[PDB]
A paper describes a structure:
The ER membrane protein complex ([name]) has emerged as a conserved player in the process of membrane protein biogenesis. The [name] is comprised of cytoplasmic, transmembrane, and lumenal domains arranged similarly for yeast and human, despite significant evolutionary separation. The [name] presents two distinct and structurally conserved cavities on opposite sides of the transmembrane core that differ in size, shape, subunit compositions and apparent function.
Comparing detergent and nanodisc maps for both species identified two major gate conformations. One of the conformations, referred to as the closed-gate conformation, results in a more occluded membrane cavity. The yEMC detergent map, yEMC nanodisc map, and hEMC detergent map all show the unassigned helices in the closed conformation, preventing client residence in the gated cavity. Consistent with our observations, the closed transmembrane gate conformation can also be seen in recently published cryo-EM maps of hEMC and yEMC, which studied LMNG and digitonin-solubilized complexes, respectively. For both species, subunits encompassing [name] to EMC7 form an interconnected core complex, while there is additional density capping both the cytoplasmic and lumenal domains of hEMC, occupied by an hEMC8/9 and an hEMC1 N-terminal expansion, respectively. hEMC8 and hEMC9 are paralogs of each other, which have not been identified in yeast. Mass spectrometric analysis of our hEMC preparations reveals slightly higher abundance of hEMC8 to hEMC9, so we modeled the cytoplasmic cap structure with the hEMC8 sequence.
Numbering used by the authors:
A (entry chain B): 12 to 272, 281 to 292
B (entry chain C): 5 to 90, 121 to 187, 214 to 251
C (entry chain A): 26 to 46, 51 to 340, 368 to 412, 417 to 463, 481 to 502, 521 to 883, 896 to 955, 961 to 993
D (entry chain E): 4 to 34, 40 to 100
E (entry chain D): 14 to 22, 43 to 53, 160 to 183
F (entry chain F): 11 to 110
G (entry chain I): 51 to 115, 127 to 194
H (entry chain H): 4 to 32, 52 to 130, 141 to 156, 165 to 206
Amino acid sequence: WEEMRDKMRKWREENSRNSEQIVEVGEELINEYASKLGDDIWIIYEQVMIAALDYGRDDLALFCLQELRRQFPGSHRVKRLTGMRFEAMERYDDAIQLYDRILQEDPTNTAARKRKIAIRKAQGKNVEAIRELNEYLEQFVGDQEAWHELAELYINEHDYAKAAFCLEELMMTNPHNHLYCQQYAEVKYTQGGLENLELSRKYFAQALKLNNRNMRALFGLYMSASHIASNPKASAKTKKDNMKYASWAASQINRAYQFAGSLKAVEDMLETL
Amino acid sequence: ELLLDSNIRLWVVLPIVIITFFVGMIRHYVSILLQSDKKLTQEQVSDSQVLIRSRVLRENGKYIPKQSFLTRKYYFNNPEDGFFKKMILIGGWINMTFSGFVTTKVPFPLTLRFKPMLQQGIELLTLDASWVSSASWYFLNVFGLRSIYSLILTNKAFKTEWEALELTDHQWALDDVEEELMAKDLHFEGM
Amino acid sequence: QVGKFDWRQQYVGKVKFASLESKKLVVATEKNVIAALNSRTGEILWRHVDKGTAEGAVDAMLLHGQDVITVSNGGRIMRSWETNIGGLNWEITLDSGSFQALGLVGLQESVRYIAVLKKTTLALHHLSSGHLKWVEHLPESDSIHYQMVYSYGSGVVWALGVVPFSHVNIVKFNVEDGEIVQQVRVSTPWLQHLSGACGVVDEAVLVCPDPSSRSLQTLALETEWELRQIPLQSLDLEFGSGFQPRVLPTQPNPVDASRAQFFLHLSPSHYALLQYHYGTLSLLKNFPQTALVSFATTGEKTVAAVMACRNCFNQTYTINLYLVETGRRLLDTTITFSLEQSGTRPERLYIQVFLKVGYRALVQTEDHLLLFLQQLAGKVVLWSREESLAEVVCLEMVDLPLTLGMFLKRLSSQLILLQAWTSHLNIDTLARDEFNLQKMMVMVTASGKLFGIESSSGTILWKQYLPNVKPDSSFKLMVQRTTAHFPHPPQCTLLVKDKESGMSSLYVFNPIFGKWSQVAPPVLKRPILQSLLLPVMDQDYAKVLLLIDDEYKVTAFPATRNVLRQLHELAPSIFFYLVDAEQGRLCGYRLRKDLTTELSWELTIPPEVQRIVKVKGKRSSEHVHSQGRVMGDRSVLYKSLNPNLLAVVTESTDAHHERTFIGIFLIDGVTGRIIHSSVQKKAKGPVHIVHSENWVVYQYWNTKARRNEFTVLELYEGTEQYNATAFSSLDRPQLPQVLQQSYIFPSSISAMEATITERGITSRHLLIGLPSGAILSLPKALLDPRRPIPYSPDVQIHAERFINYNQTVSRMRGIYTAPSGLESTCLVVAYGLDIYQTRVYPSKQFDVDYVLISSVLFGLVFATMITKRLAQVKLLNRAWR
Amino acid sequence: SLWKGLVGIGLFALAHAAFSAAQHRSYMRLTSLPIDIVLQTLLAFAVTCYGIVHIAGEFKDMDATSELKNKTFDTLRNHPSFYVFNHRGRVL
Amino acid sequence: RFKWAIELSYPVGYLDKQVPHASDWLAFIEPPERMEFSGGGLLL
Amino acid sequence: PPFISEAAVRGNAAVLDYCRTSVSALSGATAGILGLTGLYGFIFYLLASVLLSLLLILKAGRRWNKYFKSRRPLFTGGLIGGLFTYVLFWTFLYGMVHVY
Amino acid sequence: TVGLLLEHSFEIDDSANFRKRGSLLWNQQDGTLSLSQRQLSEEERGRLRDVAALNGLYRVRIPRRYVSSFVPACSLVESHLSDQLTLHVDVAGNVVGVSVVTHPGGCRGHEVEDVDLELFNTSVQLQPPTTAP
Amino acid sequence: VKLTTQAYCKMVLHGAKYPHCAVNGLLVATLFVDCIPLFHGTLALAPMLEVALTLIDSWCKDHSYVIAGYYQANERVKDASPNQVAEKVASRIAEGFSDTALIMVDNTIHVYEHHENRWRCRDPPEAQRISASLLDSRSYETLVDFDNHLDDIRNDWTNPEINKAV
Ligand SMILES: *[C@@H]1O[C@H](CO)[C@@H](O)[C@H](O)[C@H]1NC(C)=O
Ligand SMILES: *[C@@H]1O[C@H](CO)[C@@H](O)[C@H](O)[C@H]1NC(C)=O
Ligand SMILES: *[C@@H]1O[C@H](CO)[C@@H](O)[C@H](O)[C@H]1NC(C)=O
């Protein structure tokens, strides 16, 4: 039986928003198992709400918010949940005021100003979002959940030069995860440039090393190798050793798909260059 | 060898154990009930965070490229621009209540200099110290349960950081990983 | 404890005189004591003990209806008590006399004046005051044995005298003159006394029997010539073979003449009831099977109580009344009782009489007992009082007696105990208890009466009487076995001497039930001298208890093969030491393979300047824990124990304070070498000594500062341990070193002893008996001689550690201290003419609000489980802020 | 909760052994040690040690990259505190 | 044969300027055994 | 290896301390019951520590070096804090049973 | 001054055949005690050693002007004849008793062919009684 | 411009599976007969898009099919306009076919056409209700796409099961 509470804590453990299973598996617990959970309930009223809102329902939202007010009447965190539903039903100034109250009376309440940025991100004005975000970062330098979104924003504005700064800062605080590294590679290859491309290939390989199972960075390594080996700006030594790299990667991918058990198409692609 | 009563055993031994156990637990819980907040402002928070940034940059600036490392280091060390450029009562009571007994024995021989601490109430001055008092029981259980609880439960720093960042290299450490991977083979058979 | 286990019984002794007639009576006993016992139950109102020794000996009790009268100190003193609260009313002293007799007189109808007879003079005092009234002298006063006196109230007072075998002389005096009225002198040289032979029947009479001719010499003492005579031959009234017979008259009012009728005592069991007319006898009755008889008198009526053997036989004696004037037996008033012991004879009787008739009796039987009998048919003894305990000699304290298949046995036992717990919620009925404190007492006594007591609410459980025992003898008590070899019982022993023949007797028994065991002892043929226990137990657990003859040969009671074999083996490790105080010589003998003794050492003393007083030796039933006294500087200082040591004490024959001294000697019983020979000058006082494991103490008197003092000795060998496992006294040359000191004590002393508790851990105390009856405990470590705490300036008296706060003891001839099973208490006993028992706490009872315990327990538990759910909540609400 | 029950059982057997030893000592004092009690206490000791070993916890690797072997980008992108709702779920 | 070679084109601390003894054992002692026995006294 | 979690470390150390202190207490009791002095009970504590180390080794399997860089703490572990517990439980049960 | 005999006796049956080994000389005036002996001829030595075989006794005796005492052979023969004698007396001056002890100890066993034992290496010393305060 | 049942079906299925973020897809046929859901996420990144282009180009040349269209779908419901990315994508696709179709779903269908002009509009049934019924049958949870292939090779970008479903 315990399966479901742990599978509704999993989706809280890895920020996996999949919000049709959340509600379907939660509503049962929140309705008719309150006792069983035993004061592990005041968080299931907040995970369900912030996803049942995105499903569109809007009837369970207040069913949760009212109980939360009941047990936790005076607070500044549930003020956030009151200022979210507001902006769901296109009430933005009410939300800004609801935040400004707690912010003006209790600074060091980052969530509020974060949602204030979220409003602008919603409306469309990105420059203003960026300005507000950086102004926040100055005070609270270091919040990875911020940096990654800031880089994503710089991307969405088609600027592939300053995002890499944010990622470099981001891969300096936890450099044992392939994802940040391969994404830095993906943004610096798409940036073009010889120095940029060699940096890209390097960090590609450095990423793959860690997991030894990521496929994206492997394909990236092959493509970058072929690019250099058909780029008339490099010493012959670079060209030949990159051809060797590409051949070895090709062989390894052949091993991969062999292990799997189409093949011909990818092999034609491989022998293209 | 002293033929002893059992009323002694029960009503002298056990209260000591129970009381010290539960009062240590209660002290823990009340300490958790006492700690207030000391949040003051955002300023020292920002300073601390950027200090940790500098420290990190110092220690793991060998996974990023040269130029970005150098930008950050110079910025933090740019002339004038760097951000570092501008028991008592309970013991008394219990001894007052059990003032003079002989509780139990230890199965290994003690010399005589251990005596005045184990008994601490008794004017016998003839017993081998291996026979213990009651208050020593308290003082000893104190330790035993202090070891079982673990089972059941400014500008100075600015300038130090700046100077410590002066003497620093890049040490890219990223110049041979390519061959290292390419060296032998790839490894995955666990999908 | 003050009301739980400490009791005091007090006694007065064996009566000599007494007097009955509201709810109180009076006695006077051998031990110079007066008492006012309650006539409904044994209990005292006022003891007035004065002096144990002769100088407070009583000679004549006499009361007055509400006032007692007394004479002490061989005719000197004359007191006058109250009979109600012992409050003395007056007291005087008289001149030297032999106190031949005492009386009580009046003028015509009164009781104003009293008489005396000191064999030299005669007196007449007032009574209310005590101021003398007149005195005069006897005619010749040195040759006619003035042994008696008589009044008939009114007018005058006579006075008789007679030597054994020459003649009688008679006198008569008149008040306010002291003048000798005509003094008759008639010859009757056949009588040998007149004290316990004769008596005045009616108002001028002398009467005495001559068994030769079986006749009666009679005299109307008012006016008659030559003692007219009446033969006791007309009647069948033969005398006894060699029995001195006598008269028993009566005079219930000393002012009105004596009654005519009177008893007569012919032979051990022959009495008669005569009556005297003007000149002719009238006989009423004769009794051939009487042991004892008494008179008594109410307001006007007068009776006679009589005892009889019924069928002597189960000691079932009967008591009856007869009327004196007539002889009539009374249909009612016939008591039949019986004693507990086998040979026990009354030898005494007194009477109390109501006016309803009815009566009550008092009986002082031979073996120091007192019965008070009532006529009713229920409990016939209204109270029984045991006076033999007023002189105890030696005693002892004995312990009471005791009451995969393995897995299945365990299961069964556990089940049984479960069932028991669930179900839960006199001599033959008891056994010893854990950390035993019962410790049954066995005491022996100089009148030959063995007892047994519980030591807690002392109750006599058994008794025994062993006959043919003199007043001055010598006892020794030895305990052989205690509750082992289950088919075999416990048994103790007893050795008695006789003090006149040197003979000896060995009485063996079982201390628990009081019975002489099945076996017989060897018959002691020769005078025995000494005894030791030899704690090596034979096949039957019995210690051998060897004895020494006067022919210097041995005798053992359990003389079995095994024991004799053990002796033939280990004879030469056994030694006797003997003493002779007359000439002051000690001797020491040994054993051989067979049982003989070959002299080993000897030692004398000049008996003209030194006189042995007493001898001390360590108790064999002791354990010593620490072999050393650790100095302040991590230095050991070993002590010399020498189990076989013994102390001797002496004092001079010159009693002048100028050169009077006390001597001390320490000696080894085996070899005969002196460790120490000391002398303390300017002291005479009677001594009181103690000899512990390694220390010695004695008390004495300083005649140059006329005050009491102590002196204490300790013995240390050095820093090494010579042969620290065997201690043979044949091999120690190194005579130890001595430390001593002399403190002072501000009072007198009586018997002293030391506490004890097995394993000898706790502090060791000294129990002191003062004369006032105060007991006193003193800590040994205070008397240490390693003191610079100077030479003691009046070492203190503390009236806060007195055991007997107001439960005082009279004379304190000795003390006994015995061990518990609990190691922090010692059992105490004090004899001295009033017993005492208690416990002591030398180390504050260190091995033993009740509800408050579980109260705080559960308070804490619930406060814990209440604070948990508060911490959780506050933490959670922190999370959400 | 099997192992916890096992532990409780062994421990209770040990306490029963203690009780039996106490009563045995009282009986022998009224008048050195048997076999059955010894095997029982040792049984309890060993069978408690095994269980408390199994139940205390489970070891965890100390190579972090093993944990993130399978950590897809999509789970790591969606930053909750910047969630925003103007999208097609409305139109469901 | 590069068919798809696509070319597209205050963050605090960001600038692109290419900058460079005895007693101990005493307590354990056992009381020694006695060998001789001596009893008697004062000649009853 | 180069990159460490520095949290699983503490988890593993904590579970080790748990097991060690607990079995130490248990040995103290099971010794204090059938009271034995000096050499024998020290032999007992040491033999039990060895048993513990062996059991943990069994649990890991080939030592699974990803868990532990070295087999040292398996043997040594926290061995002092167990001594106090051991003697305390000698005391407790010796007292309760082999005295009164 | 006066003289006082000193009989010394030892046999196999622990009996008494008391013979002499010389006298003591006591000066009362100042107070001093000395000895004057004769030596042990062959048969005396054989008697002493055979008595020693059985752990017999050496007995010493003097008169009251009697008194005696004893000391084993085992503790003397192997001592090369170092005995210590004391003569305890009273306050006014009267013989009280005797005390004889050998130096040192006894019964280790080493015999010396009995040719050291011809000088009686003795020590004698007396004491009045030690007074006290 | 004629769009096949399964084309619109898989199009809207993809649009609904990852709604919170923009997505794109690649159509192969003007009679469009098949779509590819390939990506879901940022989409402003070349390399994975480029290997997808190359692989799909080679595979359809093996089967001699051509690339016939692009589609993009935004997350902002009111945004139905092209950024640089779709412009370049459809530019190269037109270079390869010169008749390609660009698509933007209103999501509340805005097919464009480029003839020397910035992808202007073109002239604007049962298959609608078909797809709606499927959606309400809750089957979009088993639709795999290129990104899933790059995560787990064990997927399949031909999506044959959904094809046979209809
Ligand atoms: C002895 O006295 C007892 C008194 O209890 C009596 O029962 C018994 O009959 C007497 N003996 C004889 C032979 O009558
Ligand atoms: C003590 O006496 C025993 C008796 O056999 C002897 O063996 C031992 O040696 C003696 N002690 C010393 C120190 O000689
Ligand atoms: C004589 O007496 C001394 C006393 O110290 C002793 O040492 C010595 O052994 C004895 N014998 C001889 C032969 O000196």
